[PDB]
Amino acid sequence: SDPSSINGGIVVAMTGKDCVAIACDLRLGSQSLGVSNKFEKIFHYGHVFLGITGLATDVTTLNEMFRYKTNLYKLKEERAIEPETFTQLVSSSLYERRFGPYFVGPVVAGINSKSGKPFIAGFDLIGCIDEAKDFIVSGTASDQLFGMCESLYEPNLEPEDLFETISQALLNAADRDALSGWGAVVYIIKKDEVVKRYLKMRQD
Amino acid sequence: FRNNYDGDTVTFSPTGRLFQVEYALEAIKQGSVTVGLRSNTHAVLVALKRNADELSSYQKKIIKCDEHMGLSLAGLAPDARVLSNYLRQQCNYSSLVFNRKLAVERAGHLLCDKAQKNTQSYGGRPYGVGLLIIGYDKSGAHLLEFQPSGNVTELYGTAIGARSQGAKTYLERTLDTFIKIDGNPDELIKAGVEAISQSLRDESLTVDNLSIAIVGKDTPFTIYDGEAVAKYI
Amino acid sequence: TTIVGVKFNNGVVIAADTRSTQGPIVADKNCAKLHRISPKIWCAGAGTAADTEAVTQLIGSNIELHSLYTSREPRVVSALQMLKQHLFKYQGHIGAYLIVAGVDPTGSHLFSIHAHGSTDVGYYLSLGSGSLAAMAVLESHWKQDLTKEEAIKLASDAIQAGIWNDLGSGSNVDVCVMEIGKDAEYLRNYLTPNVREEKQKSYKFPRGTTAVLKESIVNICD
Amino acid sequence: GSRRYDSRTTIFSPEGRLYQVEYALESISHAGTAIGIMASDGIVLAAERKVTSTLLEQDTSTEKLYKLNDKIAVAVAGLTADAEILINTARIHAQNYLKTYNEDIPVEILVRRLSDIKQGYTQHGGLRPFGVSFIYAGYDDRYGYQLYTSNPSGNYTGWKAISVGANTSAAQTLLQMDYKDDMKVDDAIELALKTLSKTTDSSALTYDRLEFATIRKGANDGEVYQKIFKPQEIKDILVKTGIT
Amino acid sequence: AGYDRHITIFSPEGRLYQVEYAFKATNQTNINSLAVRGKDCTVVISQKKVPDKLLDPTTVSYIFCISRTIGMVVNGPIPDARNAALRAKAEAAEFRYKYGYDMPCDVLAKRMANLSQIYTQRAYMRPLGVILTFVSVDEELGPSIYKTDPAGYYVGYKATATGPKQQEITTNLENHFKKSKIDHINEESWEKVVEFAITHMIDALGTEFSKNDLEVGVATKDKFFTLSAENIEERLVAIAEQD
Amino acid sequence: GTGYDLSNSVFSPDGRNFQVEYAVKAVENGTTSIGIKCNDGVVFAVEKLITSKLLVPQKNVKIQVVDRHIGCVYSGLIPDGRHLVNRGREEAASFKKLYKTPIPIPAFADRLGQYVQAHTLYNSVRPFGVSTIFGGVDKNGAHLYMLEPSGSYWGYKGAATGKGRQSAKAELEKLVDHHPEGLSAREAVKQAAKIIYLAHEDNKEKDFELEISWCSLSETNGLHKFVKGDLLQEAIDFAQKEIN
Amino acid sequence: TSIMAVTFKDGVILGADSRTTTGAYIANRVTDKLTRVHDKIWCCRSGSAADTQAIADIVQYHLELYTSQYGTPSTETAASVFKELCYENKDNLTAGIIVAGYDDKNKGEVYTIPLGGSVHKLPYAIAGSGSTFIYGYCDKNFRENMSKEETVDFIKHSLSQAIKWDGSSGGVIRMVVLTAAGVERLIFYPDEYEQL
Amino acid sequence: MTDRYSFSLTTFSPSGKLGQIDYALTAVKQGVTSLGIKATNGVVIATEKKSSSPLAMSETLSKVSLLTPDIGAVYSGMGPDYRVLVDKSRKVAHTSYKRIYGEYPPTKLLVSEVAKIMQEATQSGGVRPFGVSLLIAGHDEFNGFSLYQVDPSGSYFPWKATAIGKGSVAAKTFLEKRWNDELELEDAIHIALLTLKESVEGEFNGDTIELAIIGDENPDLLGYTGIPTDKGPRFRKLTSQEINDRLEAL
Numbered sequence A: 001s002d003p004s005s006i007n008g009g010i011v012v013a014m015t016g017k018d019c020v021a022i023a024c025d026l027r028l029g030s031q032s033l034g035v036s037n038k039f040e041k042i043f044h045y046g047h048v049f050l051g052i053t054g055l056a057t058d059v060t061t062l063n064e065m066f067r068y069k070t071n072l073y074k075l076k077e078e079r080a081i082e083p084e085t086f087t088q089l090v091s092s093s094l095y096e097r098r099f100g101p102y103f104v105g106p107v108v109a110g111i112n113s114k115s116g117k118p119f120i121a122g123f124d125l126i127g128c129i130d131e132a133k134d135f136i137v138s139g140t141a142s143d144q145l146f147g148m149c150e151s152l153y154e155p156n157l158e159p160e161d162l163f164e165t166i167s168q169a170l171l172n173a174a175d176r177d178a179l180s181g182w183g184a185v186v187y188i189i190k191k192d193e194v195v196k197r198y199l200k201m202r203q204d
Numbered sequence B: 001f002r003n004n005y006d007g008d009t010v011t012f013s014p015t016g017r018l019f020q021v022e023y024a025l026e027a028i029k030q031g032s033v034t035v036g037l038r039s040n041t042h043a044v045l046v047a048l049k050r051n052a053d054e055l056s057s058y059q060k061k062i063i064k065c066d067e068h069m070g071l072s073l074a075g076l077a078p079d080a081r082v083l084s085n086y087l088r089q090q091c092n093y094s095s096l097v098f099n100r101k102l103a104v105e106r107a108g109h110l111l112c113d114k115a116q117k118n119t120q121s122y123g124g125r126p127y128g129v130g131l132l133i134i135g136y137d138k139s140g141a142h143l144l145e146f147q148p149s150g151n152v153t154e155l156y157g158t159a160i161g162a163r164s165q166g167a168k169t170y171l172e173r174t175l176d177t178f179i180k181i182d183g184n185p186d187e188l189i190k191a192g193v194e195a196i197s198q199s200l201r202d203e204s205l206t207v208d209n210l211s212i213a214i215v216g217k218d219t220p221f222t223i224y225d226g227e228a229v230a231k232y233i
Numbered sequence C: 001t002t003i004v005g006v007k008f009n010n011g012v013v014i015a016a017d018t019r020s021t022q023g024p025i026v027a028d029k030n031c032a033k034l035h036r037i038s039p040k041i042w043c044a045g046a047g048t049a050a051d052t053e054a055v056t057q058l059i060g061s062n063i064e065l066h067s068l069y070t071s072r073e074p075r076v077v078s079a080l081q082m083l084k085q086h087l088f089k090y091q092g093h094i095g096a097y098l099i100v101a102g103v104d105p106t107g108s109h110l111f112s113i114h115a116h117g118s119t120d121v122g123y124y125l126s127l128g129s130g131s132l133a134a135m136a137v138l139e140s141h142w143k144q145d146l147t148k149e150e151a152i153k154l155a156s157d158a159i160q161a162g163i164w165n166d167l168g169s170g171s172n173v174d175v176c177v178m179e180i181g182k183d184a185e186y187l188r189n190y191l192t193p194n195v196r197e198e199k200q201k202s203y204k205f206p207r208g209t210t211a212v213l214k215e216s217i218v219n220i221c222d
Numbered sequence D: 001g002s003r004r005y006d007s008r009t010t011i012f013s014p015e016g017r018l019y020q021v022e023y024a025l026e027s028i029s030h031a032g033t034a035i036g037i038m039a040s041d042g043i044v045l046a047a048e049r050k051v052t053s054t055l056l057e058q059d060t061s062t063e064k065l066y067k068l069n070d071k072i073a074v075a076v077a078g079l080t081a082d083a084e085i086l087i088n089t090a091r092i093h094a095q096n097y098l099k100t101y102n103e104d105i106p107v108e109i110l111v112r113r114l115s116d117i118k119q120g121y122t123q124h125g126g127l128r129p130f131g132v133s134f135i136y137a138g139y140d141d142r143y144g145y146q147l148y149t150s151n152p153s154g155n156y157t158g159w160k161a162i163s164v165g166a167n168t169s170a171a172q173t174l175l176q177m178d179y180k181d182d183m184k185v186d187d188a189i190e191l192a193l194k195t196l197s198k199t200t201d202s203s204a205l206t207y208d209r210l211e212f213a214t215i216r217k218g219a220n221d222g223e224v225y226q227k228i229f230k231p232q233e234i235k236d237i238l239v240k241t242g243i244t
Numbered sequence E: 001a002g003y004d005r006h007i008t009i010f011s012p013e014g015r016l017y018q019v020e021y022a023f024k025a026t027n028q029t030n031i032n033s034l035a036v037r038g039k040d041c042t043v044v045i046s047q048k049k050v051p052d053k054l055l056d057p058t059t060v061s062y063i064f065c066i067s068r069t070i071g072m073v074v075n076g077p078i079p080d081a082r083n084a085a086l087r088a089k090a091e092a093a094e095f096r097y098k099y100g101y102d103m104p105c106d107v108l109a110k111r112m113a114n115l116s117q118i119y120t121q122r123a124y125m126r127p128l129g130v131i132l133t134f135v136s137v138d139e140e141l142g143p144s145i146y147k148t149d150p151a152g153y154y155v156g157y158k159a160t161a162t163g164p165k166q167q168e169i170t171t172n173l174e175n176h177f178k179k180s181k182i183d184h185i186n187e188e189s190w191e192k193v194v195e196f197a198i199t200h201m202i203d204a205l206g207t208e209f210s211k212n213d214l215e216v217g218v219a220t221k222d223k224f225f226t227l228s229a230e231n232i233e234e235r236l237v238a239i240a241e242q243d
Numbered sequence F: 001g002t003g004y005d006l007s008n009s010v011f012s013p014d015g016r017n018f019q020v021e022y023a024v025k026a027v028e029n030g031t032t033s034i035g036i037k038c039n040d041g042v043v044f045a046v047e048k049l050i051t052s053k054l055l056v057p058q059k060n061v062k063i064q065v066v067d068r069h070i071g072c073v074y075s076g077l078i079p080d081g082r083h084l085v086n087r088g089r090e091e092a093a094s095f096k097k098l099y100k101t102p103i104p105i106p107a108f109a110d111r112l113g114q115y116v117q118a119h120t121l122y123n124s125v126r127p128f129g130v131s132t133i134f135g136g137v138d139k140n141g142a143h144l145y146m147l148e149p150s151g152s153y154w155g156y157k158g159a160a161t162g163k164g165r166q167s168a169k170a171e172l173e174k175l176v177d178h179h180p181e182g183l184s185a186r187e188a189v190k191q192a193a194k195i196i197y198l199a200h201e202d203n204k205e206k207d208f209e210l211e212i213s214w215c216s217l218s219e220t221n222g223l224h225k226f227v228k229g230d231l232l233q234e235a236i237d238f239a240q241k242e243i244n
Numbered sequence G: 001t002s003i004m005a006v007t008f009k010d011g012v013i014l015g016a017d018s019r020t021t022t023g024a025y026i027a028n029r030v031t032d033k034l035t036r037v038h039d040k041i042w043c044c045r046s047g048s049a050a051d052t053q054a055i056a057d058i059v060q061y062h063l064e065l066y067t068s069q070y071g072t073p074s075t076e077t078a079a080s081v082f083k084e085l086c087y088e089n090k091d092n093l094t095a096g097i098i099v100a101g102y103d104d105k106n107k108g109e110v111y112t113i114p115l116g117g118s119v120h121k122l123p124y125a126i127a128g129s130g131s132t133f134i135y136g137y138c139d140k141n142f143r144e145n146m147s148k149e150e151t152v153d154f155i156k157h158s159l160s161q162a163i164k165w166d167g168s169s170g171g172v173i174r175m176v177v178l179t180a181a182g183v184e185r186l187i188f189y190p191d192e193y194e195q196l
Numbered sequence H: 001m002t003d004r005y006s007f008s009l010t011t012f013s014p015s016g017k018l019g020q021i022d023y024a025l026t027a028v029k030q031g032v033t034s035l036g037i038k039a040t041n042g043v044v045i046a047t048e049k050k051s052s053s054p055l056a057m058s059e060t061l062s063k064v065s066l067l068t069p070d071i072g073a074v075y076s077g078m079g080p081d082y083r084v085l086v087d088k089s090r091k092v093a094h095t096s097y098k099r100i101y102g103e104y105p106p107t108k109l110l111v112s113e114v115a116k117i118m119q120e121a122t123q124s125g126g127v128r129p130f131g132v133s134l135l136i137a138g139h140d141e142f143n144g145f146s147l148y149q150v151d152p153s154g155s156y157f158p159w160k161a162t163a164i165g166k167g168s169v170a171a172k173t174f175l176e177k178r179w180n181d182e183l184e185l186e187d188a189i190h191i192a193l194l195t196l197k198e199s200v201e202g203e204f205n206g207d208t209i210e211l212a213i214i215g216d217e218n219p220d221l222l223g224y225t226g227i228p229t230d231k232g233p234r235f236r237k238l239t240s241q242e243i244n245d246r247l248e249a250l
């Protein structure tokens, strides 16, 4: 039935002190059948990251679309696109399919290279922009993620702390969702460096 | 002069002439003579068919458009096919939609307007053929003369083509006589053959060389060729 | 969602709550439902959030171009006509319910548009799920000839009626004042009566709590 | 009607030549010279800025070297406006290839496309051809460094060293004189500047009249790098090579 | 090569002959017209010459009502004049429908000027041989005069004249203004502004007029109307009892 | 230069359009036709040349009706004339369909005018080779009009075009002076037949056939009808008498 | 919704309630259902607000353009444009419209255009949900050529009964008088018409 | 009817020249002088308002146009061509950029768009090139201030300062002398007025001159308050008064 519930999966972003984090599970199943535990849902164009939950085919399609668009954007603008701008591009791109949308739940995370300010935003399937200053959740376990975040979260966490927090939010939420899990990955983003870690979680 | 205003039909000459139409009009004069005349009961078409070799055939000059209407051509054979086919559709449309026989006067107006369209719009060329239309409708027997300029006229009789002026004078002279040949087709046809012969020169009208058609009161438009016209030579 | 519009002796003011929802879940606890069409023409929107934003920016964009073309200040009746004809063209498929207001060379104006394209005109209006709660307040306290402050109170009170009594409404109160003589003043988060109480505990985890399978640096430089 | 004013841009001459293509080329011949030299470890693009001034801003300026891809770039000779139209369709073509196959577009595939577009304005449409000639410098894992050339006609060919624009005959001769298969990028870089220096219609070959680009495989990495020199970088290389 | 004179493409001098010849056609009617701005009205006077006895004088006019508020006087052949009027009327109705307010004089003029500009650039469209003078009492700009030509040009005026003797009328008016120092006729009633208009037309042209020699249009707050032969006469008698 | 008369939408150096002027030549060469505006309708008359005894008398009607209250007669290229009427009928039909009321003559006149003026805007079309006299009775009385190949048209008291347009105009102007209080439909019919007979002198070579039609509030009830039988012969007599 | 138009001696009068609804909620209690399409040609709207407004807005545009080209349009013509729109788009419209206009030669005319898209010229017309409750009342009280006073009364009484029984109707009663004298807007409040 | 002009009206001559473009350029030369000057904190563009009748009201006609709140344009050549170009330019800034990214286009890109429109009128069927040259001056966050020139060919280039039209040769020379990479906006405005003077025959005042600049943000010109990140338009057209006050210290 619900297209956004065929493959499953979740994504979640969070802001910390001069840093942003974004994580996702690795499951890609077909209803109850688990099919792949290597389906990362996070992508990036320059220093801007994009996570996408929803129907796998569209997740793939949107990534290929934003790569196309961000590449041309760099060639013409002669600079990499910023988080805020990209958010707009994501929003208009989705609304352009207003009456036959892609079944995805996009999440943007990054640091404005010019202002150094952390940025995260979520969108409904037709572009409605939700720009939160703390966290953004998406996926079949979004309710669980909201519960986790609303409690675990606290402002200006240091990278090392934000990592614990985001990982625990993701992990415990996925464990209550039959369609999420099968491995997770977490990105900790700072002005200078970006670290990627794979979490150890239940495989059921 | 002329050379600067005859490259198409979308150009008027300094004197208000349309040369392309006039040149088209010429193709008719170069065509084989054909005659048309009518009484109050019938309308008749007589045409001289022309051949290429003696190993060839004689190109048909008369075309039936419906059971009550038909015509004879002079000029571009293809164009006559196009126009007569258009006249067949109009006759057909009038029957299918209104269960009404297309009046000859109306058929004429249609042809005129169709022709006119290829004389005011760039790209098109006028039709290079003259047509004589005869038919029997609700107001009786009729004869029309159609010119590629779009001018369509109702007459008692007429002729078009090479040496046509011959027959036309004859009819213009015989008028009072043939227009009264009512209830006697063979007489109207004979008057028609006598008219056309006034435009002969090369030879005399033979059997596979003459073509006659007739329509009237209780006479569905029919063409006669070969031995069928022998009794008139 | 609760959005209202109130006229006062020398202008017009519009207000709205800041809750965004998806089913019974709050999507955004502080979104902005007040949209700027032109400097002095703002519009409050309810219904499908993406729609209130898109249609609002589309007409706004066209109003901008029209203004440059005609060398005149945009007029509310223009935003109103462009919006309604658009919504009508889409047989109500664009879930936008708007309260459009502002001041222009012809005075101050207050209208409302419904998803299918019909429009209303009045001195006080309300739309959204909190529509009824807000309207009860307005029906109980509006009077002709209100002062800028009176109007802001009334508008702000009506939104609260929504925040407190309507489950689809909540959080803060956003206001925008458009007075016939001055610049329009947008008051983002004019009221913030819903601050979360200090959490009972901190859930900051002791580092090393999360089991990591593998690590690596990501190359962002080209 | 209209026929009267139709130039008929797409017809053969009694000799079987395409008038407009010929004339377009005639136009190109007066454009700032552009040179492409391919070495074993890289490619070099050099072009002379036609029309310059004290006031012309150069840090912001670009009129002959355009980046099409991350591994492909072109040098322009002719109508800049016309070139941009083509350049943009080219950038799009590369991105499409990438989206369809998840692989960077092979250099020749991009060139054949652009050449095809041109070829079209040659056979139908009643429009004028693009007054442009491109020198393509790119790299892929199937043919390594490649250097191509396309002109108003819609034909393209590969080269070791080539020039387009003004004084090509002179430039070609000089390159044919000192080019050697075993050249190294810096070798090519010098040969390039020297040739221009000899064909220039100007007094001296100053940096403010040049655009320079190199596609070298930065050894400390293992990948290929595209670099369009900035005013100062050209000013430097101009001193070293011995033209100061 | 010598066709840069038959269609709207450039000549070596960078000129558009077809546009210049279009201007030439505007004088075909051999009629002059002038517009002046009152304190709160706008008036356009135009000569009217109906020498044929078989014509119904009432059906002859180069003045048009584009909308309740916009009035237009044309200098040029009637068929192009009517082609232009009809378009402007449609442009005015449509504008009101889309934007919700009455189209302003200057805007309508800009829109028509742009349309003219296109015939200047597109080869299959010929310019219209007419000069359009639009007048009204704009709700934002007050009395207004905007005129457009076959070149796609237009601008607003304090007053203006058009036709074979445009220069005479113009300099006459220029003078009156160098005198008054104000950019309009300081008159409350339009009847007086109409009288001023006709008076100066006579001075500059050195000709006297009868009620059938003129055509007059007046634009007031929320209405543009034309005068009748009698409305004119009454206005003509008035100037007579001043001289 | 020259050749400003080969393409239609072209402006000559003195601001004219020769193609349209040449059209007028075709009109002037046509049969003479007129229109007289009486005080409750209009009368239309025209010259039908007997090119031969072979033409069936009365059988080639020239005057045409548009809707049920409008009459049209023209001189010049007949086919062009019919073409314009077909457009008029469409235009009248479109108008009625939306506004219910049959098209007012003044509205109809501009419909024809805009259409004809349209054929002087492009070189891909030829101007109309006819001048048309037309009119009828509407909500505001009678209206007579004449349209030129230029698209120009005005309201007339009397109108004439064609070969004998001068004789006619002379005669029409006379009437105007001898009837400052108007003319009756019955009288216009008679007078018209005469004007046609006189104007036939400039073509006295071939014999002709007269045709009259009218639209009078009191005589035809605002509807357009052809004058025939007794009233027709009677007018022929009145004309045949004063022609001697 | 309760709307009616009555032709009388000096012209014609249009009347309507001011209630717009969405279910049982009164979206607007001071609605103006008497819409102007020309100087002296107005209409009464019933059914979809969105549809009737869109239709009216278009007719107004057509009459304005019509005026620019052929002078003043008749009341009949205005009814014709409405009808054309309501008939040709019958499958996507829910508009019951009454067209009333005053002209110097015909006094006042009334054309009712019901849901189907048909047109009906009448001495007076009633429409809207409230109209059903006053068919009897109006049939027994309408007289041709009443005076302005009698007409205003007839309408005030009729609509008060409509407003009384039909929940979709209510608010104030609005009237528009169209005569040679000009255009007059009348408004009657509950307290006044309720106790009639 | 139907535009049968589907073929190019601008073609290559045997010499390789594109006539119509050359002629268009000629038309630009005949045009009234206009110039541009980029300072370290602003850009200025100006031209002379050659009123074509003492009865015309030169204010009702602007040669200096705002394209986006940080980009303005001025020209030389055919006024009507420029006008429609300005409308297209304002629209393209929306349809091809703001509607996609929610922000106005940076100068080079908008210029790039306008340029394309002109290039097309040089190759499309049935049209003539535009008879104008433009000077676009604007500012964007990542590129700062910039000045561009766009020709009828569709070509464009960045400038520190330049002039086009009638006395371009002379004006350009006067600018090459006075310009330096340390000018402050006020200085450029001054150099501007001086440069323009030479090219002006008779009257030279705030009523016969038209000048606007791209400089600091103008919150006062925004029209509303309450949105921190929205600080106001950088484009500002000087007033007749402001121009005269300057001419006094000229």
Ligand SMILES: */C1=C\C(=O)NCC/C=C/[C@H](NC(=O)[C@@H](NC(=O)N[C@H](C(=O)O)C(C)C)C(C)C)C(=O)N[C@H]1C(C)C
Residues within 6 Å of the ligand: A124, A125, A126, A128, C001, C002, C019, C020, C021, C022, C027, C028, C031, C033, C045, C046, C047, C048, C049, C050, C052, C128, C129, C168
């Ligand atoms: C005002 C509340 C309301 O007026 N109505 C309640 C419905 C809420 C709408 C809006 N939230 C959303 O639109 C959410 N997206 C969404 O519903 N998408 C549809 C879906 O079924 O998934 C698509 C369009 C078919 C999400 C963007 C939050 C909301 O909260 N409305 C508020 C106010 C206007 C933000």
Ligand SMILES: */C1=C\C(=O)NCC/C=C/[C@H](NC(=O)[C@@H](NC(=O)N[C@H](C(=O)O)C(C)C)C(C)C)C(=O)N[C@H]1C(C)C
Residues within 6 Å of the ligand: C114, C116, C118, G001, G002, G019, G020, G021, G022, G023, G027, G031, G033, G045, G046, G047, G048, G049, G050, G052, G128, G129, G168
């Ligand atoms: C006259 C009352 C009626 O004639 N008929 C009752 C139907 C009402 C129509 C109109 N009000 C609306 O259209 C309101 N929207 C609406 O009803 N939407 C439907 C819904 O049930 O929510 C959707 C389309 C299923 C709103 C736009 C005001 C009304 O009140 N009609 C009045 C009079 C003509 C205003």
